[PDB]
Symmetry: C3
Subunit: 485 residues, 3 copies
């Protein structure tokens, strides 16, 4: 006789299908990335800027507590602790601050340059500081910033700078808001002052806004900062009748795109990644992951899922077409070089021979299925975490609804795709075995008896040569047409 059979093994891998849960299969492929390396890493060769617990404002203004910082000239993203300790040491605010953060999120070059040496403010006092910025602990001040009356006069404070640096330049300035009209006169002599800044494209003025306020870092006063991007060869003009907090430096900046800020206590560790999360980096070909929604880089789609396992092998039995676990009741652990094949028995022996033709065709098909699911997934650079101020709650919620919206689409589609394709893979195997069975059946015709269990019992002697012809589709029916029926 000769029987048609299929592979079984010792596998305990389970998959789900649209019709059935926890099916054991001989082989399966997990498409959900669940692991990371526990490290903060460089992105495509370039490290993050690490701010420790300094804020971007604290760093750029020169909060004295941010002195021992260490600022690379180039970075691919920014790492901050969740709530930075050192920001505006002299209390106040920073206009369009989240727009500024977004801009410097990834740069190809960054370099501080002295643009308005403080000693050239020759008719104002320049040494003013505050205990709120105290070092050691004498009053001090933002190290990058500088004006009060000299003797008893505050003449117009007017200076300009031409960006001949070769790159666009980031420039910050501020205006001080005193406690009361008496302090206004003490510091700046005149009341009703202004700070004007102008370039070819920016025209901005602030005036002092005096109010009674509780002390913050010991001070009732506030400083309000603003910023601009000065283009190559343009001029910035400062013009103030008082209250100006002038920059001494500006920042040369070249951008190669935008990135984002990552909130984490982790420190850079000298490895390479293409996809960073606050928990660690991911290195994967898989199309989905569930590590963390706030990633930076070229990452798989984040889904709300614990498990996405594609079946690749067949039901492990140690279907639509009725053969596997069907009229062929069980698998063969003894057939090791194929998914499908034969067992024979005659005068010369017995028995297993894998069918390489249908096995290979199936392997190729399932390889294509898997490649299709994984490769079709687009993966461009994105930074998920975003910055919004406390008066942009609606905009932060819009962003959230959008991220939530995409998370629902992808999680549902990923779960359904796996269930549907798993059903079809199981049926594909079932069909391949049925077809191999019928291939034999249709060769033998009435020269053999169809037992009903996968086996054919010949009506003639069928030796090893005969058997081989049955297995490769060249069985000579007329030759044995003598039936003994």
């Amino acid at each position: 006789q000769i029987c048609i059979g299929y592979h079984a093994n010792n596998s305990t891998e389970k998959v789900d299908t649209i019709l059935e849960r926890n099916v054991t299969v001989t082989h399966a492929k997990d498409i959900l990335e669940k692991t990371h390396n526990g490290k903060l890493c460089r992105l495509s060769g370039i490290p993050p800027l690490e701010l420790g617990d300094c804020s971007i404002a604290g760093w750029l203004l020169g909060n004295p507590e941010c002195d021992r910082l260490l600022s690379v000239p180039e970075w691919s993203y920014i790492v901050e602790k969740e709530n930075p300790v050192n920001g505006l040491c002299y209390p106040g605010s920073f206009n369009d601050y989240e727009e500024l953060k977004h801009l410097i999120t990834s740069v190809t070059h960054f370099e501080k340059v002295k643009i308005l040496p403080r000693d050239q403010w020759t008719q104002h006092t320049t040494t003013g500081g505050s205990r709120a910025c105290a070092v050691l602990d004498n009053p001090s001040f933002f190290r990058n910033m500088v004006l009060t009356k000299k003797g008893s006069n505050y003449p117009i404070a007017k200076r300009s700078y031409n960006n001949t640096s070769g790159e666009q330049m980031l420039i910050i300035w501020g205006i001080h808001h005193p406690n009361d009209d008496a302090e206004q006169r003490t510091l700046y002599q005149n009341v009703g002052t202004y700070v004007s800044v102008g370039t070819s494209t920016l025209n901005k003025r602030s005036i002092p806004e005096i109010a009674t306020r509780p002390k913050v870092n010991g001070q009732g006063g506030r400083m309000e900062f603003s910023w601009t991007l000065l283009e190559t060869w343009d001029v910035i003009n400062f013009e103030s009748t008082g209250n100006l907090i002038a920059p001494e430096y500006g920042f040369k900046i070249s951008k190669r795109g935008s990135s984002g800020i990552m909130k984490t206590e982790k420190t850079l560790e000298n490895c390479e990644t293409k996809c960073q999360t606050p928990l660690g980096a991911i290195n994967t070909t898989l199309p989905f992951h569930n590590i963390h929604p706030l990633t930076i880089g070229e990452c798989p789609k984040y889904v709300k899922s614990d498990r996405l396992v594609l079946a690749t092998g067949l039901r492990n039995v140690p279907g639509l077409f009725g053969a596997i676990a069907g009229f062929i009741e069980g698998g063969w652990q003894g057939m090791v070089d194929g998914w499908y094949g034969y067992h024979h028995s005659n005068d010369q022996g017995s028995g297993y021979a894998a069918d390489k033709e249908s096995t290979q065709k199936a392997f190729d098909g399932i390889t294509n299925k898997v490649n299709s699911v994984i490769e079709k997934m687009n993966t461009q650079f994105e930074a998920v975490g975003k910055e919004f101020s406390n008066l942009e709650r609606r905009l932060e919620n819009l962003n959230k609804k959008m991220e939530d919206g995409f998370l629902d689409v992808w999680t549902y589609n990923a779960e359904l795709l796996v269930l549907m394709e798993n059903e079809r893979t199981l049926d594909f195997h079932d069909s391949n075995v049925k077809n191999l069975y019928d291939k034999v059946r249709m060769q033998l015709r009435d020269n053999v008896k169809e037992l009903g269990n996968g086996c054919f019992e010949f009506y003639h002697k069928c030796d090893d040569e005969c058997m081989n012809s049955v297995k490769n589709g060249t069985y000579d029916y007329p030759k044995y047409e003598e039936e003994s029926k």
Copy 2:
């Protein structure tokens, strides 16, 4: 003697579509599209909406006299307004960052007013000033939550502060009055060249009054401009004014339980419960989709632009007087007389005849189709959302972006829903076809040449097959060798 293989039919006229075929009549079906609502405005997880009627949130917080019996509740999970609330700034003017204020109070768990600046302590200023714009019966009146004009012929500097000892963050509103003319300025405040300043740990503002002729609104060329801040616990707010300050008398303690939204509808609350509210009524469903209204609040099915999503659960209904070729194929029709299963046998022998369901195939199909339905339904994620959003008339672009987002997901879900239904119905009908073909073959491969295939799902035995014999056929233990009585064939 004979045994026939067949499948259930009934009196169903339910129709489904499939990828390959439209309006296929099936024996059973299940709609996964929620189309009904209860006509009521409900509580959401036990917690009622704040019902503002035709007052705006401004009108309510300021204390527009037309809102007086507003009936504010301690706790709320969303806010209900009429489409265009008529009672707002009774004295005309504006409200800075109003939408962000509306977003913040959309869902709160403790809401309590605190009389932070008792009006009676403004002892050196007049405090009863009012307007016919806010008239009550029909005397001049004013926002009940707000208060300053000269006392006699003097307006001394006005200076008061409040330390938030209330135990929670506090919402505080104040305004400035922009008079129509210098004479109004002098009448009200005596002083000219005035200011209003307010400071906290994080707020710093000084406003100066704008005197200018404007068209009259509710009788007034003057305007009032309001602003708001949240005072942190233990922080201090300081007001100082030489004139034109509209002072708050009250602040509002706010503990937010996340965020929700405002629902525009004419409906009023009705002592019912729900997880998903629409302006037309509440939705109570396990279904993954609905088409009732896009502006929902709660944990809602996905909204789609569809009128019907019907999943086949039973087979093609073929009452008598596919891929596998059995159903409506080599087995011509179904059997209304077989009622205890989807698939089975009809037999005839010396003893009688003869319907019997195949409990194995039938149970397969039950479990499989239940799993399919459960998969399509259970795998859908449903998180809390308030769809309708507030944008000012200078935020059209932002409004349009929200719209583009909502429209985009609507097209995604609608297309995927409709196609999933067509595709799964095709597979379902084929699944049943397969189960019938498999049942037939199970019988055929056992019987081999001890019976003849009579065509139409039937086998005629070449031997006597009593009830005991039939059972062995039906449960798959038939004894071929036992029956060579069979030379009946030859």
Copy 3:
């Protein structure tokens, strides 16, 4: 004598992909990805775009002399500009909420410039002032819709005028303030120092003071003009008041809107064609659900995907000489000789041979595959959208959010369109394979043992089968008993 079952083949070199297999040649196919356009800028549902060419919207509404008789239409559906317009604020400055204003006039049902404040009626001021920045041929000029108010002799008295919107429609009105480079300039032009510009309607109240400060020369000028706008409601009044530095409108624009749209950037000019879907490369006219022409569309468009190709198999695998084992299986090749159907018979007997399509199964398959193609196309919901948006340089995060949203939908639709094609193509090929298998079994069950089943789709008769008999096989009326007395010899 014999009859064989077979299927159509031809010389199609059309390839598709399936989930299991790449580059399969099929007899027939259809792309559902729209890749063509008419290369033209068209009317959108009958209504033309406003064509601004190398002018910006600001250049146009203020009346920059280069945007003068720009030639407008009273109605438009979208606005076309060059990518980088040359003519905008010729006197340098800015426009407050400019993007909101661009978005407002993107689509209008009516638009008409009206003279609301004739410049001759500024009797106490000079009205002819201009700038070399706006030079015409080559005398100083100015924005033609605006009036630069300057002093008359040595005096600038209070400038005060108002206008009542009795036009019957809402009216766009624009005004500006001049921020001089220096005190000398302020005095030469306006005489007074410490001036202001005030503007007020029923809902708007604005006061601005000029900012005198040295700035880099733009178009020769260190001064700047800052513009603002408002919509004046029907029968509302706008009040202008100034002691200097006011740039007054002479005109306003009646506007009626019925929805919004967007700005398209392209060099193309309008060409007298019609469309529902404009791209900057040309208009699309398609029923297809997907396209790859250009992401910045305006209208009701297919979904944009990053696919080069989306080809659905419609015919079967082309095997010029599967789950069900017949096509490219035990029936090893297709027949180029069967031209009148997809599946059929080849017969051979005494009278000759012998191709004939099975009309019924062919037509059933055509109906099925037609429903499948229609399903994929017809279920796609489409709505009006203008993809291209305007954001200022301080709106990068908002611009990034918009981009993330578009990239997100691009990812969803691409992945799903591609996999849908792969998956449905696998099912379409198996559907054909099953149709052939079923036709094959129908012949098998008819002939029974009156014929030899060879195993390659052919049946060899144990009796003589003439054309009449061959025909009964073909149409399901073969008479087994009739030839039983003859067949096999036995």
